[PDB]
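so ive been stuck on this for like two days lol. basically i have the seq below and the ligand is fe (iii) ion, smiles is in there too. i just want the complex predicted, nothing fancy, no docking runs or whatever. if the output looks off dont worry ill sanity check it later, just need somthing to start from for the group meeting slides
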Amino acid sequence: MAKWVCKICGYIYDEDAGDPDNGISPGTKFEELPDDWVCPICGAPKSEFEKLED
Ligand SMILES: [Fe+3]
């Protein structure tokens, strides 16, 4: 699945990993993260992530 970078801090939101410590099961697409989900490292909103693909 896809990987996304937090443009602020470099954390990778890896769809295959999810973010279980913050309520997101492995395999959750970035689109499906709640609107108010934030980078678990720096607190940046979803807007600040970029999809790692051409
Ligand atoms: Fe971040």
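The beta strands are 3-6, 12-14, 49-51. The first strand starts at residue 3 and ends at 6.
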